[PDB]
Each structure stands twice: as structure tokens, then as C-alpha cells.
Design a protein around this ligand. Structure first.
Ligand SMILES: OC[C@@H](O)[C@@H](O)[C@H](O)[C@@H](O)CO
Ligand SMILES: OC[C@@H](O)[C@@H](O)[C@H](O)[C@@H](O)CO
Ligand SMILES: OC[C@@H](O)[C@@H](O)[C@H](O)[C@@H](O)CO
Ligand SMILES: OC[C@@H](O)[C@@H](O)[C@H](O)[C@@H](O)CO
Ligand SMILES: [Co+2]
Ligand SMILES: [Co+2]
Ligand SMILES: [Co+2]
Ligand SMILES: [Co+2]
Ligand SMILES: [Co+2]
Ligand SMILES: [Co+2]
Ligand SMILES: [Co+2]
Ligand SMILES: [Co+2]
Lengths: 392, 392, 392, 392
């Protein structure tokens, strides 16, 4: 397979552009020119690109410099036909953000953070972005007493309400997606899982403008089931965006190519996204790859790794399709009663009164006999893996 | 120290009554008599007792026996002065619940689970319980293709809506607390964290009636910060109840005495619960110990371990108060700007327009000078710890 | 694909025989007769069976019963052609072993554990078993002050040394395999990893008679790389047996079918065992499956899962073979310099002085230039997954 | 409590000198001058300093430069009375080491790695160092097919045998300590735990010269019991050095101050090292703090955090002593039979033949009765914790 713009594969400028300076060593690669990055991505099939303000414009560029950069950027976008679906702001690199942006203990830092974001919203709106992604990487703590969480969530909410206001007033029409992460770089990060971020969003002034941008590895850093969490995000209708990558459980942030960590979970994720209700995908935003080319690689390895993300997604998609169209899989699903979960437990018009009255629901229920019937879940799981292995 | 009824220490009947039959070996202790349990716990200082229907009344007890049992139990309560703050239902032991109660693929099991709960609701109502705790231990899966999560959430919701309805109509006045857990016994349990459970409750028909019952060990099973998650729950006003115990990170469910796992996090948690605003506790519900006396112990070790839960909470409370009252701590708190997070980021009446007009928040802001100043967090953490060690 | 006796797949009687009584619920399956188990497994393609003394003969059977059971068992093996390659002893189920067998703090329990084992050694020898597997599931602790580790290691060694003495003297010719596990059932188990077990064995009196029996899920419970750990056991020549199963990182012991956990690692493992030096396998013992049919299944599901293990292993082998046989893989391997690690760092007869005199090894070495060339590892890995996926 | 030279606290130059440049942000502190560090460390009570070659002399310094730094360095040592008990080599920062030093797939880097190390050995020898620590941080892989583990161990061994030959010919009298780490910076690092490292070492040519340098946080990254691993290292007599710090389970490398992570295990660890065999410590080497002052701190914070390390150790030492001196603990120890483990299982001159003849060890053994007695481990643990809290 080959990707089409229909696939909606995007990459962050900072993925293919990571110079591979890790916590223990120097960069192994030279910087990638953003224009060059646009051309290369277009060429591999990406439909869009995303970036943090500071990825494009060096922190502290004068207006002439910044203006020049933006202009060339837009020219490259025009020429390749790539779009900018989302934009984001770097609130974690500069020493000033060492205790966070929106929730730094220092009031002046909080005011500055908001201004940095507003400035990025303007640039996003001008490039046509539809969503503003917010990754509060420095919002959190290494020690429990250093941060008042309640005060922190109030401050977080306070900054976000202002951003929605500004957008709505300017008629920018942006949506906002909060990106959860459990830890790294802070010992513990606020809004640690997709669950925590959805519950928070529900407390904003204009909740309908807010959703989440969950990332594969972030949920796997807590050993959570990524597909299962995505399923819940879809049930809430809060999956505004998605970051795809690979990770090997609880350890530092690996940012591997999507599919290179937990393959089986990658497989069920692609099944959930594409084999949505009514034939169609359950999700229609960008399929964003938020990964990093391993430090052992050079620029050839960088493009290889970019192509690997798309290949991995398309291969899994193919196998998910085949899986569902297999009459033996259907038979297994029927035997496992997967679809029976979709039928209400209560009959149409039945309330507690009638249920209470139904002797077959309690008084005459043979718990023991039902408890002895197998669900055939293992056999179903085996068919799924055989499809993934191209054995069926 | 000594526990008072005002401390509100409660224990589940299944805690001191755990016969220590684990996944790999037989019970090392004989069955605990419920009346004895009531007597024993009243003696150690508990103010209330909780139980699952099946802890008290053997599954499949005839009306006569059931009544018999309840009546004796009520005497014990009477005699002792213990109350039943919350009640719960066992939807995980009997083989019929191997795929869940409320979200079992099998529709007949779902109907049965509802009926089983309704009945405990009545008993609870009759015993004066104010909360119904729901632990969906078998709601989940071992294999991704075996459970439609979205359908399961719909069915979970459908069952809860009905319980609320019934409670309201019978005038039971119950509140409902969902207990999240990441895994064990299912490979992955639905509503894996406090966050996922709060997000869910928010989608119910009478959300004001639902909250959560987070457990120390459940959150630590995913290596999450328990204190920080409880802080978020209180922010949301969804801490209906709390289960206290100990755990040593991501491994099987250990159920150790509270403070026997992550000691630093038990300290910070007691601090958060008791050193609430207006001097007073941030939480006024039962401090329930949901733990297990280790298998190597006999009944002496059983009572020893029950008392240890109370001693641990009281010893930590004592140090948390001393911590807060220390002038040097007050000095560290100030240097760390912990309270500055409570002051709004914006001046009263300021909106994006005025913030954009402030050159000092961006254009003339010296991020470099601000980024060079330290927060003094390590010194603050060291003082907290010396207070915990009784070294100050 | 079809299994042959030369594949040497074995199953423990306790695998397919697990009644599914977990820590939270009652058994969902009836007991499996050992004889039926023998016919069933011979039937799905296994070449041998393994068992715990107590799996075959109920703890506390008189010699008449015991003898009767052994004779029937022997007939079954007889009629089916299945062998008993290894035997083990249950030193974890009975309450007496709550603090361990060989390392119980109680001296009487230690003497008893040894006797229990000596007897199982007699049975194993009579059945033709060649290896005695020892899984010290109860050796360890929940609390640090409860167990003197040093004393524990002396006592573990004392017992093992006697076992070797006995076998050697009765001429049983047995080999001993220690099975490492990090936790469950004890909070922490002694000799937690393949490394710790190997180091320990090196200290015995007849170390040549001792090795390890590492299990997939055991090493994954610590988020360790199973394949890499086996590679090290092979380098030391201590891989005497191997238990295969699946697990999803650090959580309770799942014991899923082999390959249903970390699929990518299951792949690299088959590759390591089968594509040994010179086409031939690097390992020659039994490929034992120590898994459990999920609690949600009935006997149909049980036989299904037994076959899933064999299937998984043969599908993976087929793909690992193809991977290595692929000229493009062979080319990527050359580019990544994988085989270059086999060339000694030093020239033949080169020592520190010749090395110190080689200016090209340091003085004239261009680290910057070498530092910039990529290893092409992403590409090589992408090739491996495409083979696994059957896309190549 | 104040530190003495007898306490033997040492710090690596790179601990206090860490500029806080992490994987996600710029450095928040300026460079620390080495002479300054020696002076500041002498002042807080450290008895020695350690360093990587590159921490002292910038990579690629000419000889004049290199020579001047050493001379200055030695003068500071001289003036303060501080010693250099161990030295190490940076085989992880420079890009040339992206695939490892001693086990790089590239043969020229391997040769270069050995030369860089021999050079550091000469300087260590000149400074009086007695141990060479080797942390193989870049040895491992991100992908299984990228690294031939067996060949990697051969090359690791080839290099170490050479280092030993050199030291021994020259009369340096060094001892070598391998430092294990499960991951970070590599996805999986070779010799991941203390056990893997000890087993490896037993395979070298002059094993008596090799041991390990385990680090608190490195074992905890795998959720292993650090005290228990140290106990096993002591039993093998391979504890040549120790790195102390704090960590909160499996997540990125935190490098907190000793005791700021798992406080309970920090306590049992100090009890193990100090309440040794006679009355005397079980370990006699340096107590090295390999930690990092949090990114949120300035140099005031740096010096505070250095002191905190020493303060945590001395406070725990004090409590460990008090614990063991308590008659109630002695009583709890007696009831738990801790000391009974130290008594051989067999009576003097008893072998399998005499054990087999003892009907009481099996035939007449009342296992049911023994299994019913408790060990009182919880009560013992509760006494330990109360000593820790200064509650007794
Ligand atoms: O782990 C870093 C995180 O994954 C980051 O890349 C965010 O996605 C970005 O700052 C918002 O788009
Ligand atoms: O881990 C089991 C869980 O913690 C359980 O004990 C519940 O809390 C109970 O079913 C509701 O009270
Ligand atoms: O986790 C249980 C363990 O894996 C067990 O099944 C052993 O392998 C057996 O006791 C020795 O063969
Ligand atoms: O994870 C960093 C590691 O702990 C390191 O600082 C080593 O100790 C050093 O390279 C050898 O001393
Ligand atoms: Co990320
Ligand atoms: Co991301
Ligand atoms: Co629990
Ligand atoms: Co609970
Ligand atoms: Co096992
Ligand atoms: Co096993
Ligand atoms: Co370290
Ligand atoms: Co270290």
C-alpha cells in the first residue's frame, strides 16, 4: 500500500527534526530545515504537518526574522499542498517553565505562558489550523508539598477559559485538545491519563470546545490499555486528535514508530478507528505520528522511520479489514456474544418494577448453569492474531 | 494515640475475615464469625463496618436463614454502637460473573446482576447505609476483541441510571460510589483510574448522585500518585468514599496495611485529607481500610494488622499537623511560592484584551532572569521528611 | 502447520487442568482426570507431560491410592507414547509452606520440604524424567525485617546440595533447574530474575548439575526483555528448560497462551531458539507451555488454548525462518553491522601494549566522523515486523 | 547528626555539577568548577569525590590543558583532605558511543572505548583510586535483531580481561565494579539487574578482581527490592561499591536524594549495611550519592540537596540502630523465627540417608498443625515503621 491524503497522516516538525540529543548524550544529527521537512513529508504521503511555535521560529527571533520564516513556511505549504491541521506551543523547554507554564507557582510565569499561547493561536488561525493542542509537560511536581493541585487545576482552568474566549471572540473557530501524560519530565504530571483529562475538560466554561489528544506511549507508560482508553474517549465524544507511537510499558518515553512497541494493541487500535459503526471510521481527524527517529540513525534512517509509521498503519488496517470480513471470525464473535452487549439490558419500557417482578431474572435464574458456559474468548483472540500474522 | 468515633475508621468484613486462600495456596485461617468481627472491630476503635451481601449471608441462603443472619447482625451492631456507612454487592465471585455483572456479554447475567444489587440496596437502606459502593471487578477483558467498550459503558450507564431511579423512588437517599481498578482479576478492568471513573459518572442521568471510591493500591498498581489523584477528585467534589491500603507499585494486588507500601505518599495523603481549608479536613467521610492480613499470620496477626491500620493513620496525622505548624516549613512554603498559585493569574476584571495590552507579560518580560531563580522544593521536601521521621 | 514429537512441546498437567479458581472467584471448570489429560494432549501433538507431585497424587493419599494412581498414569503414557521429561514438587500450596519450603524460618518445615522433594525425585527417576524443576514460589517475603536473605541463601544451597548428592549417589542422573520469579505469591521472591538464579547456582557444590528454567511472563513481570535474558542464559549454558506463556507487563501473573502477550518479543525468542548457529536450534530441551486457559472458558476453550500455544510457536518459527532467509534482511543485517560484533575487538595476539601503540585506536581516531554514520536499525526492525505480519 | 570521614560519604562530580539540561529542556544552572565542587563537598562532610574523565577534562582537551586541570584538581584534594576512591569513564555522551562503547556493533569504536578507559585507569592510579566503575549505559538495543547478545557478552568480557591484565602487570591494584541498569538511555541495556551483572562477572578470567556497583534507582526501575538484591550481592561478596539515590518505581531515571523515593526500602537498606555481622557494618566501602539536584533548583538548592543525602543516611542509621536495640523488637524477632533460619536444616553429620530415616521429617510430620501457626510478620513490620517514624 501507499498513503493518500484521505489517510490523513500528519507528523510534527519535531519528530523527523529531533537531533537526538537525549538526557545522556549529544545530538547525533544536524538540524532539519522546516522547508526541507515540508518537502520530504509531502513526498512520503503526509497530508499535513504540525509544530510548536519554537520549532519554526527560534525562541526570541525578532519580528523581521519571524516574519521571514513564516513567509517561506507558507510558500513551502502552498507548493506541496500540505496543510496545518493543529498547532501547539512550547511551554516546557525554556528554563522559565521549569515549574510549568499555566500552573507555575510564580504568577508572572503564568501570565507569560498565556501570552505565548495567544500569539501561537493567531499564527494557527492564519495557517488555517482547526485545533490547538496543549501538552502541559511541566505542570506537576517531583515532591507532593511543592504543588497545590486544587490551586493548580483552578489556574489551568483559568487560562483555558480565556483561550476559548479569545478564539470565540476572534471567530477563529478553534477546538482545544489537552494531551495527558503520567510523568516525564516532571516526577508526576497533572491530568495523567486520558480519563483525568476528560473529567477536567468537563469543568471548563465551554466544554464543547474541549477534547483530548491521547498518545499511545503516554497511556502505556502507566501500563494502561490504549485501545480501551480510546474507546472510552470515543464514547464521550472527546477524541479531538490522536498521537500515534510505540512504547515498551513503564520506562522512559521511547517514542518508537507506531506498531513497534505493543503490536497487538496497535492492531486493535487500528480496528477501532477504521472499522467504526456503519462501515465508516469511528474517528475522522488527523492520524498524527508523535515519534522520534532512534538516536542510532542518520538522515536515511530518519526518512525510513517516517515511512515505517505509515506502512505500519496501512498493514494493520488491511489485516483489521480482513479480520472483520472473515465468516469464521463472525461466527466466533456470535459464539462469544460480543454484539449481545449492544442490546439494552432492560426491555423496551421495562423499569425496576417489572424487573423486580421477573422471576427469571432472580428467583428462577440458574446462575450455576449459565456460569458453566464458556465464552470462547481464546479462540476469538487466536483468529485475530492469525489475521495479524497473515496466517489466514 | 487512641482512635475516637470521630476519626471514622471503618473496615470491610472481608478484610479481617480474609481466610488467606490466594491464587497459589489454601486458606491458612478459619472463617471469621460476623458477630465476633463486629465485637472485635468495635474493640479496636472502628466506628463502622461494611460488607458485600455474600460476606454476611452465604450465597444461596433461604429466606429463613438470611433473615436469621441479618437479625443477629443487627443485634451485634446494637450491642456495639457500630454503624454501616456503606454497603456493597459481590458481582465477582460466582462463576456466572466471569465476564462481568453489569457488562457481561450475556444479557441474562446483566439482568441477574441488577436484581442482585437491588436486593442489597434494600438491605443497605434498612441498615442505615448512606452509600452504595460498586466495584466492577469482572467488567473488562483479557482480549481486546472480546468486549465492545462503548457498548459496555452504555450498559454500565443503563444499570446505574436504574439503581438511582429506584433509590430516589423508594426514598432511600443513597449516593453511589464507583470504585476504579486497572486490572486483577480481569486483564484490563473498565474505568481503570479515578480519572476514568469521574469522567464516566459525569455522563449519568443524575450525576449529582454519583462519585468515586478510589483505593490507594489501585492507583499505585499503575504507578500513579495517589495523593495527586485524590486532590483532583476533591477538586471535582467526587470523593464520596476512600479505601486505604498499601502497595509496592505495579505487581499483584497486595492489600497491605495503610502506610506499609508507599510511606511518603501515605504521609502526603493524610496531610491533604486532614489539613484542609479553614483548619478543618478536606474530607469528612469514612476512612475505610480495605486491606488483608498477610497469609503468614494467624488470628493474633489478624487483630494486630487491624490495629496497625489505625496506628499508621494517627501517627501520620500527628506528623502532618506538626509539619504545617513549623515556622521553618512556613518559610520554605513561602520561598517555594506554594500559596502564590492560589492567586489568580489575571487581575480582577482583566480579560484577554487587557492581558494582551500588558507589555510586561510578554514583550518586556525577562524569561531568562526568571528562569535562573530556584524554587527551593528539595529543602521543602527534606523538611516534610524530617517531620515524618520525628527528627524535628 | 503440524507439530511433531521433534518439536518437543510439553504441557504441565496443571495447565489444561486449572479449574479457574482465581483470587477473586470460584472455579468455573470441573477437575481434569490425569489419564484423560494424557490422551487429550497426545492428541493435540504434545510429546511429553510434566507435573507437580500433588497434581497427580492428592496431597495425603495413602500408598495404596498413590500406587494405584501412578500405575494408571503409567499405562496412559504407555498407550500414548508421551514421555515425562521433567517433574517438580508442590512447595507452595499447603498452608505449611506459607513462609517457604527450603527457606521457611521454621526449621521443621525446611526438613519436611526436603523429604517431600526427595520422594518426588524417586517418582521422576522411575518415570524417566531427566530434570527436576524447582520453583521457590513461597521463598521470600512481604516485609524486609522478616527474612534474613543471606541465611535464606545458605539454606537454599544447603538443601540443593543434598538433593544433588542423593541423585548422584542413587545414580538418577538428574539435572536441576531453578525457576526465577520476581513476585507472586510473595511480595518479593528470592532469586527474582534469570540473572539472580544463574549467579546463585554458580555457588553450589556441583554447579555443573544446575541451571535455570526461566519463564516468559516471570521476566516480563519486571518489564525485562525475555529474549535478551535467554540469550544471556544461553551464553552461560544454563538454559536447562524453558516455560513459555504470555503476559502484559508488570501486573499479576496472567499466564496467557504463548505469544498472546508481548508478540514482538515472542517472535525474537523463537528466532533465538530456532535459528541457532549452523541452521540448528540454539536450544534442545522441551518447549514447555506453563499457561492457563482463561477463566471465561469451558473444556472446549481449554483444548482450544492448548492448541493455540503450539500454533503460535509454529507460525512464529515459520516467520523467523523466512526473516533470516530474506536477502534484503541479510543486506540490512550487513549494513547494521550485527555480525561485526562477532569479530574480536583485538587483533590476534594483540595485548594492551600493541593497543596503546595503535594511534588509529585513539590519537588519530575521528570520533566525530564515526559518530555521524547511522546503523540503519529502524529499517532492519521494520523488515522483521513485515515478516512477522506476513507482508514480505 | 554530623558526618565524619569515617562515614565515607562520596559524591560524583557530575551530581552537584548537573546543569539540569533534561530530555525536554535547556539547562537551568551554570557550570560548576571542579575545584569549587571539591571545596564545597569537603565543607558538607564528604570524604571523597569521584568523576568521569570528561567531567574533569573537557572532551578533546589538549595535553597542556589536560595537565593544568589535573594539577589544579590535585591541589584542591590536597588542601581539603578529600580522596578519590573510584574513577569512571564516560562511554555514553559522545555520539561515537550511540551503539555502545565495548559492545558497539562497530569494531573501531570498541577499540577506541578501551583506549579511553586505559587512559582513565592511569589517572585513577595516579590519584590513588582503588576501584574503576564501569557503567555500560549505551550497551544494549532498541530492537532485538540489532544486537547479538552472545557476541556482545564475548566482547564485554574480552575488554574487561584486558583492563585487568593491564592493571595487574602495572601493579595498579584496581578492583572493577560493573554497574547494572535495566534501561535508559537504551530501550534495554545489557546486564540489567544486580544478578545479571554478578553472573557475568563469574565468567571473567580474574573474577576475584570483579564485583558490582548497584544503584538504588536502577533496581527500582524494574520494581525489584533493592535491599534484598544488596543482601544477595553481599552473600556472593561482590558488593565492591554502591550508588545511593531515590526513585519512584518504573518510570524514567529520577536520581532523587537518597531516601526521597522508597523510604521503607531506604530504611531496611541502611539497617543491612550498618547492623552487620559483628556489630560492625556488613559493608566497608564508600557510600556514594549518585543523584541529581532537581531542575527547579538553583545552587542554593544544589548545596541543600547534597546535605540532604547525608542527612537522610545518618537519620535512617540512627533509627535502624534503635530498632535493633529494642527488646520489643527482639521479642518480635524471636516470635517470627528470623534467627532460626541461620541454624542449618540438617544436624551436624546428617545427610540424605539420616534425613530419609527420620519419620518425624515426613511420615509422622503434622503439616496441618504447623501450617496453622502464625509468624507474626505484620507486628514485626509495624515495630520497624514506628522506629522509622521516631514513634518509639
Ligand atoms: O512527549 C511529549 C508530547 O508527546 C509532545 O510531543 C506533545 O504531543 C506536544 O507538545 C503537543 O502537540
Ligand atoms: O480489590 C478488591 C476491591 O478493592 C474490593 O475489596 C471493593 O472495594 C469492594 O468490592 C467494594 O467495597
Ligand atoms: O507461576 C507458577 C510457576 O510458573 C509454576 O507453574 C512452575 O513452573 C512449577 O511449579 C515448576 O515447574
Ligand atoms: O544512570 C547514571 C549512572 O548511574 C551513572 O551516573 C554511573 O554511576 C557512572 O557512569 C559510573 O559511576
Ligand atoms: Co509523547
Ligand atoms: Co504527543
Ligand atoms: Co482493592
Ligand atoms: Co476496595
Ligand atoms: Co509462572
Ligand atoms: Co513456570
Ligand atoms: Co544512575
Ligand atoms: Co550510578
Amino acid at each position: 500500500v501507499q498513503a493518500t491524503r484521505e489517510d490523513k497522516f500528519s507528523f510534527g516538525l519535531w519528530t523527523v527534526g529531533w537531533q537526538a540529543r537525549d538526557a545522556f548524550g549529544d545530538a547525533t544529527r544536524t538540524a532539519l530545515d522546516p522547508v526541507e521537512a515540508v518537502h520530504k513529508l509531502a513526498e512520503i504521503g503526509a497530508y499535513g504537518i504540525t509544530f510548536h511555535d519554537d520549532d519554526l521560529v527560534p525562541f526570541g527571533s525578532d519580528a523581521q526574522t519571524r516574519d521571514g520564516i513564516i513567509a517561506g513556511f507558507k510558500k513551502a505549504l502552498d507548493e506541496t499542498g500540505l496543510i496545518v491541521p493543529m498547532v501547539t506551543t512550547n511551554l516546557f523547554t525554556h528554563p522559565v517553565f521549569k515549574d510549568g507554564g499555566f500552573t507555575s507557582n510564580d504568577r508572572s510565569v503564568r501570565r507569560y505562558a498565556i501570552r505565548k499561547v495567544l500569539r501561537q493561536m493567531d499564527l494557527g488561525a492564519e495557517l488555517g489550523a482547526k485545533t490547538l493542542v496543549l501538552w502541559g509537560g511541566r505542570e506537576g511536581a517531583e515532591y507532593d508539598s511543592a504543588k497545590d493541585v486544587s490551586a493548580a487545576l483552578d489556574r489551568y482552568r483559568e487560562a483555558l477559559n480565556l483561550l476559548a474566549q479569545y478564539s470565540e471572540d476572534r471567530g477563529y473557530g478553534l477546538r482545544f485538545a489537552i494531551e495527558p501524560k503520567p510523568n516525564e519530565p516532571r516526577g508526576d504530571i497533572l491530568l495523567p491519563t486520558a480519563g483525568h483529562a476528560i473529567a477536567f475538560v468537563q469543568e471548563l466554561e465551554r466544554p464543547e470546545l474541549f477534547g483530548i489528544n491521547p498518545e499511545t506511549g503516554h497511556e502505556q507508560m502507566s501500563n494502561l490499555n490504549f485501545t480501551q482508553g480510546i474507546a472510552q474517549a470515543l464514547w464521550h465524544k472527546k477524541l479531538f486528535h490522536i498521537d500515534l507511537n510505540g512504547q515498551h510499558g513503564p520506562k522512559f518515553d521511547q517514542d518508537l514508530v507506531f506498531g513497534h512497541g505493543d503490536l497487538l494493541n496497535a492492531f486493535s487500535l487500528v480496528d477501532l478507528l477504521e472499522n467504526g459503526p456503519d462501515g465508516a471510521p469511528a474517528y475522522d481527524g488527523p492520524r498524527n505520528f508523535d515519534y522520534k527517529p532512534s538516536r542510532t540513525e542518520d538522515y536515511d534512517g530518519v526518512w525510513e522511520s517516517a515511512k515505517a509509521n505509515i506502512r505500519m498503519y496501512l498493514l494493520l488496517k488491511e489485516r483489521a479489514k480482513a479480520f472483520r470480513a472473515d465468516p469464521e471470525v463472525q461466527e466466533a464473535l456470535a459464539a462469544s456474544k460480543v454484539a449481545e452487549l449492544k442490546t439494552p439490558t432492560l426491555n423496551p419500557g421495562e423499569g425496576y418494577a417489572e424487573l423486580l417482578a421477573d422471576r427469571s431474572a432472580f428467583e428462577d435464574y440458574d446462575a450455576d448453569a449459565v456460569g458453566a458456559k464458556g465464552f470462547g474468548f481464546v479462540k476469538l483472540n487466536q483468529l485475530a492474531i492469525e489475521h495479524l500474522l497473515g496466517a489466514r
